[PDB]
Task: structure prediction
Amino acid sequence: GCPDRCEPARCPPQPEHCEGGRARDACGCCEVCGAPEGAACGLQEGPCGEGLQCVVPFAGLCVCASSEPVCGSDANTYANLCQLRAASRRSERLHRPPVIVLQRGA
Ligand SMILES: [Cl-]
Ligand SMILES: [Cl-]
Ligand SMILES: [Cl-]
Ligand SMILES: [Cl-]
Ligand SMILES: [Cl-]
Ligand SMILES: [Cl-]
Ligand SMILES: [Pt+2]
Ligand SMILES: [Pt+2]
Result:
């Protein structure tokens, strides 16, 4: 049940960082925290964060829209870019800098 036009002055204030990254609400109006990879999404559970797609049997689960390994600014290779970005947010949460992408798996 969405109004035909987003009402921005009604949008809730947000935390500096979100566990599963950023997203929009179901009306595509306000910025909200999105569900992380492997977390429940849809209806009550809310949207997946950036780079994640809500998948359902043909409630859902968030999966990374990309599936290829990536090498970050640390030594650690990440199973996908969603996991690299989460690690980066956790690092920023505890006041460090981000984990940036170097190449792809190597
Ligand atoms: Cl974020
Ligand atoms: Cl799928
Ligand atoms: Cl598919
Ligand atoms: Cl797909
Ligand atoms: Cl990020
Ligand atoms: Cl961030
Ligand atoms: Pt972020
Ligand atoms: Pt798919």
